[PDB]
Amino acid sequence: PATPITTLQADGTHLVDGYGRTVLLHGVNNVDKDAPYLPAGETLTPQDIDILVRHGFNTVRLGTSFDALMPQRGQIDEAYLDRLTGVVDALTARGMHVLLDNHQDGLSKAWGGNGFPEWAIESRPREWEPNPGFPLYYLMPSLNAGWDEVWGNTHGALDHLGTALGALAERVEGKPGVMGIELLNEPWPGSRFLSCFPNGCPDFDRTYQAAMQKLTDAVRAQNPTIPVYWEPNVTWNQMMPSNLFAPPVTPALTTADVVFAPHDYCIPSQLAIYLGLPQALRGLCVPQQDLTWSNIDAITERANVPTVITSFGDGDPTVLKNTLARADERFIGWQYWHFGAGNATDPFLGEVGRQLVRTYPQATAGEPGRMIFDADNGDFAYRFTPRAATRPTEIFVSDLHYPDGYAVQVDGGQVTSAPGARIVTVVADGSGPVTVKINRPGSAGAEVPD
């Protein structure tokens, strides 16, 4: 008898459900980049969704786009919105929190990418201008001029985008399982971009933040409570720090329910995939990804807002641990890149799923303390400080790591769920801390880190 899904509300760095619990989101991306968008029979099937439920994922970052929403100047495609909300409804019905991602790569279809409709941008690539495709096409001069039109609002592209996202926000208003709208995927600074290296670009980030605030105000005009997800400018992904929410250079946040939405990629991993460069360069992944997490802690410290890693992974099993362990350390959730529609087989049964499919606290009736999961043998430990809530702590138990069943021990509380349940429910005995251990019956188990 599943817990009805609610809206999520930011309270400091916590995402808090309607029962007063602190929520941890683990999930996947699902993004349609090509017209026609979300056409019948090519969206997530009941079976696709069963895969996600079975492995205990509770969030989908669902792609939409400016092009999908407004495929002709000033005209909302209301039929696209019907199809999108059909997908949203199928997901939230099965307990998935849906983050609506306003997606783009390479600005637009004019460059072989996606996102902005061609009618909205004047700049176009030349026949003689080399296009190396994704991801290096961000170095194309004509693509950079496109981005300048965006940040300059030269032809009202941001005004139109505001309208488009406002229309989306209006359509999903009042739906409990919608976690928010992510304003723009991987924003590129355009011709300004070398100012971001090698130490960040305070000036551009003032421009970018004003743009995001403007889109936020357009969204909130239509749907006054919907959360908004803000990415750092994408030179983040080339190790440059963000200057968001950093007065006096950029304004402090005065908008409620804003969540930070960084990506966490290993450069050499991505270079090997898209450029065919040597895979053994991934020896650099750990120090490089440690830098990103340090940048995240800095945002957390000065802004005191939540963070969700909105994409990472991209099929490389060797880099996952970097994200997963650091996220666990900070009790930060994530959405893996990428989960496609119409799986004939379950894609989480190999090396990738072994690490993504985890035992973890979907919702905690308390302040999270330290947590650890061992993805080889399933050992799990978690401690938290009880807080008033109207539902118990719910911990999803991996369906992959316990072939002989699992055992549970609780100190400071009681397990109220049945033997072998996919969800362990835990009620606190009192005000003191609760420690939960879940493991194979013959394991000595894990210890809470400290």
Binding site for Na ion (CB under 5 A): 32, 34, 37
Pick from 26, 27, 34, 112: nearest CA to 67 = 34
Nearer to Na ion, 37 or 373 (CB): 37
CB of 35 to Na ion, least distance (A): 6
CB of 109 to Na ion, least distance (A): 12
Q: At what angle do helices 46-54 and 78-92 cross, to 10 degrees?
A: 40
Q: For 88, list phi and psi in degrees, rounded to 5.
A: -55, -50
214: three-class secondary structure by DSSP: helix
Nearer to Na ion, 80 or 382 (CB): 80
CB of 40 to Na ion, least distance (A): 11
CB of 80 to Na ion, least distance (A): 10
CB of 34 to Na ion, least distance (A): 4
253: three-class secondary structure by DSSP: coil
Let me know: does 410 contact 434? Beta carbons within 8 Å.
yes
CA distances from 307 to 88, 147, 177 (A): 22, 26, 18
Q: Which two tokens stand for residue 252?
A: 């402090």
Pick from 96, 101, 119, 100: nearest CA to 109 = 119
Nearer to Na ion, 84 or 161 (CB): 84
Nearer to Na ion, 114 or 233 (CB): 114
Nearer to Na ion, 37 or 236 (CB): 37
CB of 426 to Na ion, least distance (A): 42
> Where would I find the beta strands (DSSP E) of 254-392?
258-260, 263-264, 308-309, 311-312, 333-336, 360-364, 366-373, 380-386
The widest CA-to-CA distance across the chain, in whole angstroms, is 71
What is the C-alpha to C-alpha distance for residues 171 and 165, in angstroms, rounded to an integer? 10
Nearer to Na ion, 34 or 429 (CB): 34
Nearer to Na ion, 80 or 188 (CB): 80
Q: For 158, list phi and psi in degrees, rounded to 5.
A: -70, -35
CB of 39 to Na ion, least distance (A): 6
> Where would I find the beta strands (DSSP E) of 211-290?
228-230, 258-260, 263-264
What is the C-alpha to C-alpha distance for residues 241 and 367, in angstroms, rounded to an integer? 29
Q: Which two tokens stand for residue 230?
A: 């803000």
Nearer to Na ion, 63 or 241 (CB): 63
Nearer to Na ion, 37 or 334 (CB): 37
Helices (H), 240-350: 267-275, 285-303, 320-330
Question: What does the CA dihedral 250, 234, 165, 245 come to, rounded to 10 degrees?
Answer: -20
What is the C-alpha to C-alpha distance for residues 253 and 258, in angstroms, rounded to an integer? 8
Buried b (16+ CB within 10 A) or exposed e, 405-437: ebebebebbebebeeeeebbbbbbeeeebbbbb
Nearer to Na ion, 32 or 48 (CB): 32
CB of 424 to Na ion, least distance (A): 39
CB of 31 to Na ion, least distance (A): 10
Nearer to Na ion, 34 or 411 (CB): 34
Nearer to Na ion, 63 or 162 (CB): 63
CB of 90 to Na ion, least distance (A): 17
CB of 61 to Na ion, least distance (A): 16
CB of 38 to Na ion, least distance (A): 7
DSSP string, 61-83: EEEE-HHHH-SBTTB--HHHHHH
Q: Which two tokens stand for residue 28?
A: 């996947």
